[PDB]
Amino acid sequence: PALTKSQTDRLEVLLNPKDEISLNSGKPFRELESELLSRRKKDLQQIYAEERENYLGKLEREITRFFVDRGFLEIKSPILIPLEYIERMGIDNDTELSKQIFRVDKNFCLRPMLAPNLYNYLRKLDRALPDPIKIFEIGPCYRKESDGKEHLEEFTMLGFQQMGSGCTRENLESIITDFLNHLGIDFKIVGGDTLDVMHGDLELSSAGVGPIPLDREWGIDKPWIGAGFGLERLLKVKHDFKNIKRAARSESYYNGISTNL
Amino acid sequence: PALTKSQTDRLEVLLNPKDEISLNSGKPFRELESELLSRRKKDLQQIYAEERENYLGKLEREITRFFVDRGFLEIKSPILIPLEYIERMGIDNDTELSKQIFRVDKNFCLRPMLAPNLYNYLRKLDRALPDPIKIFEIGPCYRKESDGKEHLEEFTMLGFQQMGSGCTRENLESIITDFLNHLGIDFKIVGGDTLDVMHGDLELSSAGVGPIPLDREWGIDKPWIGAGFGLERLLKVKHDFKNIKRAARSESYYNGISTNL
Ligand SMILES: Nc1ncnc2c1ncn2[C@@H]1O[C@H](COP(=O)(O)OP(=O)(O)NP(=O)(O)O)[C@@H](O)[C@H]1O
Ligand SMILES: Nc1ncnc2c1ncn2[C@@H]1O[C@H](COP(=O)(O)OP(=O)(O)NP(=O)(O)O)[C@@H](O)[C@H]1O
Ligand SMILES: Cn1cc(C[C@H](N)C(=O)O)c2ccccc21
Ligand SMILES: Cn1cc(C[C@H](N)C(=O)O)c2ccccc21
Ligand SMILES: [Mg+2]
Ligand SMILES: [Mg+2]
Ligand SMILES: [Mg+2]
Ligand SMILES: [Mg+2]
Structure with a gap:
């Protein structure tokens, strides 16, 4: 019994890049899923027990230290900006943006x-x-x-x-x-x-x-x-x-680990 | 010659909470403005020469360390969220939000x-x-x-x-x-x-x-x-x-210092 495409999609959600598991192994879906679920739960438990930092936050802090140390001033400016700034950037029709x-x-x-x-x-x-x-x-x-x-x-x-x-x-x-x-x-x-x-x-x-x-x-x-x-x-x-x-602000992944377990 | 309300508004933009300058002093607006401009330029020069960190970013990093150290997992979730989450929070008409x-x-x-x-x-x-x-x-x-x-x-x-x-x-x-x-x-x-x-x-x-x-x-x-x-x-x-x-993401203030100098 080969895996369906839907089943392989589900396993790919649970697969992390350094897992050494092959989907075609011949093992039944339920068994492969149970194995990957156990691994991902353990991955989340280890983060919670030790470092507890989010990859996107941690990367921001690392980059901040690099640029502050090289003499650059840290700016925090508005995310919600005047629409006129877009046109003033030269962004009109005939541009993708x-x-x-x-x-x-x-x-x-x-x-x-x-x-x-x-x-x-x-x-x-x-x-x-x-x-x-x-x-x-x-x-x-x-x-x-x-x-x-x-x-x-x-x-x-x-x-x-x-x-x-x-x-x-x-x-x-x-x-x-x-x-x-x-x-x-x-x-x-x-x-x-x-x-x-x-x-x-x-x-x-x-x-x-x-x-x-x-x-x-x-x-x-x-x-x-x-x-x-x-x-x-x-x-x-x-x-x-x-x-x-896997890397974005998300409710579906934490540090690239599926949250749907 | 007393200061106009518009002139006092301008000086209040340049005034920092620990300045010990009194507006009614009797000194002319131009002189008071030149003094405060010099002080605020020096404040920005000192930040740039030494720490180079933004107050809002730095406070976020300090709070992050406090909660990570107390056993809380750091989350980064979407800012742009489904509108249905608002109603599901019990937020309808007859609520301010x-x-x-x-x-x-x-x-x-x-x-x-x-x-x-x-x-x-x-x-x-x-x-x-x-x-x-x-x-x-x-x-x-x-x-x-x-x-x-x-x-x-x-x-x-x-x-x-x-x-x-x-x-x-x-x-x-x-x-x-x-x-x-x-x-x-x-x-x-x-x-x-x-x-x-x-x-x-x-x-x-x-x-x-x-x-x-x-x-x-x-x-x-x-x-x-x-x-x-x-x-x-x-x-x-x-x-x-x-x-x-003075504390917000802003193009008008940096660490509570006016950027309009
Ligand atoms: N939608 C996006 N998602 C993630 N990163 C993005 C996105 N758009 C831009 N970036 C990043 O922001 C950088 C600077 O933006 P910009 O040069 O404008 O991107 P871009 O030209 O549209 N690149 P692309 O859409 O891949 O061809 C890019 O090199 C990417 O690293
Ligand atoms: N517009 C805002 N600007 C800045 N901080 C805010 C704002 N709204 C809420 N907060 C902060 O977010 C916290 C939690 O939000 P919430 O309890 O919903 O605020 P709130 O009840 O609307 N407070 P307020 O509007 O002052 O009566 C507040 O205690 C404030 O510290
Ligand atoms: C300061 N800065 C930012 C970008 C990327 C994108 N255009 C943006 O505005 O975010 C960029 C590209 C070339 C040179 C300087 C740049
Ligand atoms: C987790 N959390 C967040 C808030 C503030 C606001 N209501 C919000 O949702 O951001 C809050 C208030 C009471 C108890 C828990 C709370
Ligand atoms: Mg590009
Ligand atoms: Mg693009
Ligand atoms: Mg409240
Ligand atoms: Mg309110």
């Missing part, structure tokens, strides 16, 4: 990105802080997305930006490289300069070197370097999850 | 509270973890509010909950008391049991002891204790801010 916005009320949206708020902080802090100005933010961002194993509608972005002196492509690649070697994540950098940070075919980050013409709409007139990274994609690679759902 | 919901699309809303997701986690984790089950979450919550010095529309909630053995009012008051003495925040506890944690006339928390009849709609049939705290209200008290805007 235009159709992906979660609107709230008449004049607000859930931010799909961190760039508007980081631009505003760079402009304001230039009146107080010495050159160069280095800032970062980690927090929720929102985009409407087609179903896909690499995309969430509710995700978490790291964004960092430096403005003034030292804003070279070399220095940008150095930050990225030190950061991902610190986290233990393999990558390739692929390249007004623009560049993407790839893990195989998966985009971990897009990064940039300024100035660009958009800066003037935000009151920025200095060179800059910066990048944006999705935390759930970093977790997906680090823990070898097959679907990014 | 009913009119305060930020709706998104047809079937979702920004969570105004943490209770639905914590109920769901308690039910699911009861199948895996030993008694008692202790969990907590910190993160963004959203409510439409009238203008007021104690309310934000975008705020941050701590919610903790224990289920099973040990769920007594005494144990609940002990958690609260240890927590606020750890943070250095003065309070009074004022009291199916219900109780509020007050700082003067300001509500820091509402807390509760179960079971209650609502539990059955969430699949819960064990005793419980729990509470919810606003982080920005804790910061407002700790730092003696006159308006909670």
